[PDB]
């Protein structure tokens, strides 16, 4: 009835995007309306960019929002990129991402 719970105790809320692990793999879990879905891996391969590819540091904050993985909200081209420094608004250290092609 709105609130989202993973049966683990975490009483999320309809729209409290979060991140869940599998004791080895990463996975972003979110509660929409029909239930609770997630994004396997979440992250993506990083090449060149500003960090020549490296372990991003998400979920980070950009433009005032948050991103648990790559994103193209910082450009008008469509190239996926991520952050490698908790402080991207100070360092600007970011990397790109493929995902598809």
Query: ω into residue 59 within 30 of 0, thus cis?
Result: yes
CATH of the domain at 3: 2.10.70.10
User: Cα(88)–Cα(93) distance, rounded to whole angstroms?
Assistant: 6
Q: Do 53 and 87 fall within a single domain?
A: yes
CA torsion, ordered 38, 19, 66, 44, to nearest 10 deg: -70
Q: Which domain holds residue 76?
A: 44-101
- Nearest-Å Rg of the Cα atoms of the chain is 15
69-93 exposure pattern, b = at least 16 Cβ within 10 A, e = fewer: bbbeeeeeeeebbbbbbeebeeeeb
- Method in brief: NMR
In this structure, how many other beta carbons lie within 10 angstroms of the beta carbon of residue 6?
14
> Could you give the number of structural domains in the chain?
2
Q: Do 52 and 94 fall within a single domain?
A: yes
Q: Do 49 and 37 fall within a single domain?
A: no
Q: Do 37 and 74 fall within a single domain?
A: no
């Amino acid at each position: 009835y709105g609130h989202c719970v993973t049966d683990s105790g975490v009483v999320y809320s309809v729209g409290m995007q979060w991140l869940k692990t599998q004791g080895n793999k990463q996975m972003l879990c979110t509660c929409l309306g029909n239930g609770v879905s997630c994004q396997e891996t979440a992250v993506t391969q990083t090449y060149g960019g500003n960090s020549n590819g490296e372990p991003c540091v998400l979920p980070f904050t950009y433009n005032g929002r948050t991103f648990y993985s790559c994103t193209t909200e910082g450009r008008q081209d469509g190239h996926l990129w991520c952050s490698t420094t908790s402080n991207y608004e100070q360092d600007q250290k970011y990397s790109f991402c493929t995902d598809h092609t």
